[PDB]
């Protein structure tokens, strides 16, 4: 990807996060889970289906279009009303495999650019108060349980308060 | 659609192609 | 703003099924989860179930679990719903309610003018 | 469940509080919004996320959530807020679900 976290510096997929396309897994002494990160997950929805909106709106249907009938002295213009034909199919064949093809394309970019633009959120937060230990992974100074956890994943991490109490 | 470019009706366009799939997510990497 | 319509008035006998659906406005596509929730007569709302945008999952009350089914034609901008094994205590005022984000919540801001499903013998 | 008082009344002009109660398993633990409900019309959102209002509720509705109790406010109280009030919220009881309060009908003297 063009942002190099999916498939880049983060690995892989998780199957066992459900509720959203990009989120967290946190490790402390009380447990480890997943974690959607909503607001994140919505902006990307509402892109999205803006996106197949737009793709939608720009087919407008297609109505009655029968063909028609030419006598054996009318060759030329059989022939043309069959160029016509087509030539017009021809273009929106072109127009709607090249549409999905970029589209397809851009779509993968931006869900790239989402994880990293989140990665780079936490690392942000969490400054040099955890250690990057790639992967995609902060390995935290301080203990962090559930509530500082939780912080993180609203983004009022407290800074001040966890650089006193490092272990 | 890519049944038939003769329609009577409200219908799709017509187009000769044979799959047009469009992604809404992510690149599916779940085993590593 | 959204416009909910659900179809028509429903009459059914016991143990048959019903499939009820709702239309939305613009779109098709939305980014909004959209659930279905009734009222018998003299009763307050119960919550039956969601349906989630791009995902498609869905998640049931455990009432209703067993016996109801949210589908949605996001081409169509429809959600359905098919509830089976009929009873008489199923009488009651069926709406589609729309959520404010993509996930199935407490928060229903916009609801649907709601259609009947009467179960008699 | 969510208990709420089955009814209340008050008189044009005066403040009510409609109080909903649950366990640490609905309201302890999630947010709560309230429905406003008028004979023949859909429930009708007043307050979510504990206290926010949508656009268009009057300034005289108000909510908030102590511990395991949440409770609507009505103030300047108008002949046509005499309707049927539900709390709602999301209850990780059994398979988790969306959960109405029973109800609590106002009725305007």
């Known amino acids: 990807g063009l942002f190099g976290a999916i498939a880049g510096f983060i690995e892989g997929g998780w199957t066992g996060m459900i509720d959203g396309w990009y989120g967290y897994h946190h490790q402390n002494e009380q447990g480890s889970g997943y974690a959607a990160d909503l607001k994140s997950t919505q902006n990307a929805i509402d892109g999205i289906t803006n996106k197949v909106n737009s793709v939608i709106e720009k087919m407008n249907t297609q109505f009655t279009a029968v063909g028609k009938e030419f006598s054996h002295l009318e060759r030329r213009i059989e022939n043309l009303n069959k160029k016509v034909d087509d030539g017009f199919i021809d273009i929106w064949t072109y127009n709607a495999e090249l549409l999905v093809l970029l589209e397809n394309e851009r779509t993968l970019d931006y869900h790239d650019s989402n994880v990293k633009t989140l990665y780079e959120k936490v690392r942000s937060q969490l400054k040099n108060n955890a250690k990057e230990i790639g992967n995609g992974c902060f390995e935290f100074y301080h203990k962090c349980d559930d509530t500082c956890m939780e912080s993180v994943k609203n983004g009022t991490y407290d800074y001040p308060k966890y650089s006193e109490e490092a272990k | 659609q890519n049944i038939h470019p003769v329609t009577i009706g409200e219908c799709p366009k017509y187009v000769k192609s044979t799959k047009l799939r469009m992604a809404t997510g992510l690149r599916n990497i779940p085993s590593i | 703003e959204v416009q909910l319509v659900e179809s028509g008035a429903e009459v059914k006998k016991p143990g048959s099924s019903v499939k009820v659906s709702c239309k939305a406005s613009?779109?098709?596509?939305?980014?909004?989860?959209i659930s279905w929730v009734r009222q018998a007569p003299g009763q307050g709302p119960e919550w039956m179930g969601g349906i989630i945008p791009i995902f498609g999952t869905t998640k049931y009350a455990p009432k209703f679990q067993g016996r109801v089914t949210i589908t949605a034609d996001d081409f169509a901008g429809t959600v359905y719903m098919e509830l089976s094994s009929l009873r008489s205590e199923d009488t009651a005022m069926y709406y589609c309610?729309?959520?404010?984000?993509?996930?199935?919540?407490?928060?229903?801001?916009?609801w649907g003018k709601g259609t009947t499903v009467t179960v008699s013998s | 469940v969510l208990t709420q008082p089955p009814s209340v009344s008050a008189a044009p002009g005066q403040k009510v509080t409609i109080s909903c109660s649950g366990s640490?398993?609905?309201?302890?633990?999630?947010?709560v919004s309230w429905y406003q409900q008028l004979p023949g019309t859909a429930p009708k959102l007043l307050i979510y996320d504990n206290n926010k209002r949508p656009s268009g509720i009057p300034d005289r509705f108000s909510g908030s959530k102590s511990g395991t109790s949440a409770t609507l406010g009505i103030t300047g109280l108008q002949t046509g807020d005499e309707a049927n009030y539900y709390c709602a919220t999301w209850d990780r009881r059994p398979t988790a679900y969306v959960v109405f309060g029973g109800g609590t009908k106002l009725t305007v003297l």
């Open positions: 640490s398993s609905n309201i302890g633990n999630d947010y």
């Open positions: 613009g779109g098709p596509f939305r980014s909004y989860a």
């Open positions: 309610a729309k959520h404010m984000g993509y996930q199935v919540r407490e928060t229903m801001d916009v």
